[PDB]
């Protein structure tokens, strides 16, 4: 019926895609999420939007997902949409490994998912996914990498970026403090706390994951509460 | 599946969705193409700090002998580029020759045209400049737009402020300007400097006779500026 169809995949008179823009509005109201590239690894720092006292915390993470052996990601937007997309990312990674018997290069994984997101904006008459994703990873082509994708299916590589709440204020702080080509993981950690300090401080309210290389193998680890509480104490001195 | 007619005729014979697609092109960064004697040059305006330059490029190789630049929706562009890349391989497979620049242009244009007359789809919101050489070594430059119209040009511009750049090229595209390879590149930079107010925020690529695409370094662009 033409009466009830909201026509989610058409152009506005200015050549704009309204559903895409409204989806990006949704993301701007989601928990703060930032990534920082360094010389010896990549990190994701997320604001937990599950800060209720009666919550159980049953998983090792709430906003950081492992995608394959060499890659993790974090999300801002509709949680349920993020679950669909992250599942799909895992499938694409495994489909590539089956075919080539090597891990999928990071950009190839991002491009593949963005093609799905783009399709939702052009045909099918469905609402797009209301998700921005930050991807961290290592491959043999470009080493340590950080990517960002948005609802239209656009992506880009970053040395540092932020999505979600107060991301404009975060990207400002990054431009000032990020020493291009001189960042270690320890100093990147420090800058992450410093940025989350302004844009949001408690260890229960943040979530930090790091990606490093050890003995020709990728290590993805979510920092324990003790390590995060020590990093918060180290900043307040500054 | 979804079968709504999205592109339809309005009173006066307008296809509004196509016209809106053309508006999306005008919101895109400027792209300039010049066909020289034995060289073809593409140049594009760039929008930042902390960004990886390699990932966000508006100049892309379709085959060994064909490359293109685009203006408009960058996601739509990636789809068209990958469709064209597949088609270049299908042609090599079936005819055992590389694609002519005109063949792949015709393909891209007809793809875009189909998305203006198919149920459940909106048009592609990009224009493309397609360059390269034929078998007989003739340099070529074509332009496609959302409607699926294509034409060959000596020189052209698409995207934001295309009309100003076009009027500059009309007055500047002479034999003297395309006499050498250095002056051909220069004319593109000058064309861009007419709307970019910049010189350090421009990406440029050159293609010579059977020599493949070469993207110029920022240090090599700083020499011309």
């Amino acid at each position: 019926s033409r009466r009830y169809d909201s026509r989610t995949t058409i152009f506005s008179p200015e050549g704009r895609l309204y559903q895409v823009e409204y989806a990006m509005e949704a993301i701007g109201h989601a928990g703060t999420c930032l990534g920082i590239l360094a010389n010896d690894g990549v990190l994701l720092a997320a604001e937990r939007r599950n800060i209720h006292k009666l919550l159980d915390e049953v998983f090792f993470s709430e906003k950081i997902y492992k995608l394959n052996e060499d890659m993790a990601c974090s999300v801002a937007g509709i949680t349920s949409d993020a679950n669909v997309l992250t599942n799909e990312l895992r499938l694409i990674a495994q489909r590539y490994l089956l075919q080539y018997q090597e891990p999928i290069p990071c950009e190839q994984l991002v491009t593949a998912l963005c093609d799905i997101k783009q399709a939702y904006t052009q045909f099918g008459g469905k609402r797009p996914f209301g998700v921005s994703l930050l991807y961290i990873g290592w491959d043999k082509h470009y080493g340590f990498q950080l990517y960002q994708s948005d609802p239209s299916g656009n992506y880009g590589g970053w040395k540092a970026t932020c999505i979600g709440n107060n991301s404009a204020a975060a990207v400002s702080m990054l431009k000032q403090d990020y020493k291009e080509g001189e960042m270690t993981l320890k100093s990147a950690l420090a800058l992450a706390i410093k940025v989350l300090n302004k844009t949001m401080l408690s260890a229960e309210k943040v979530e930090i994951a790091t990606l490093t290389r050890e003995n020709g193998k990728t290590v993805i680890r979510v920092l324990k509460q003790k390590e995060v509480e020590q990093l918060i104490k180290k900043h307040e001195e500054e | 599946s979804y079968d709504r007619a999205i592109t339809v005729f309005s009173p006066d014979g307008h296809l509004f969705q196509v016209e809106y697609a053309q508006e999306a092109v005008k919101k895109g960064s400027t792209a300039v193409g010049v066909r020289g004697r034995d060289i073809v040059v593409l140049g594009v305006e760039k929008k930042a700090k902390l960004q990886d330059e390699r990932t966000v490029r508006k100049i892309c190789a379709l085959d060994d002998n064909v490359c293109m630049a685009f203006a408009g929706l960058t996601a739509d562009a990636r789809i068209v580029i990958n469709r064209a890349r597949v088609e270049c391989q299908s042609h090599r497979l079936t005819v055992e020759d590389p694609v002519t620049v005109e063949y792949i242009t015709r393909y891209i244009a007809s793809l875009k045209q189909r998305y203006t007359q198919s149920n459940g789809r909106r048009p592609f919101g990009i224009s493309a400049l397609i360059v390269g050489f034929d078998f007989d070594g003739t340099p070529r430059l074509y332009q496609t737009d959302p409607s699926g119209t294509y034409h060959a040009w000596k020189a052209n511009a698409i995207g934001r402020g295309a009309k100003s750049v076009r009027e500059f090229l009309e007055k500047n595209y002479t034999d003297e300007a395309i006499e050498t390879d250095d002056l051909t590149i220069k004319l593109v930079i000058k064309a861009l400097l007419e709307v970019v107010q910049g010189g350090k925020n421009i990406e440029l690529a050159v293609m010579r006779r059977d020599q493949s695409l070469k993207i110029l370094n920022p240090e090599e662009i700083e020499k011309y500026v």
């Binding site: 895609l17 895409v20 239209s152 | 999306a24 895109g28 929008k47 996601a75």
Partner: peptide
């Protein structure tokens, strides 16, 4: 908008 170029 960031979805053009």
């Amino acid at each position: 908008r960031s979805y053009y170029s």
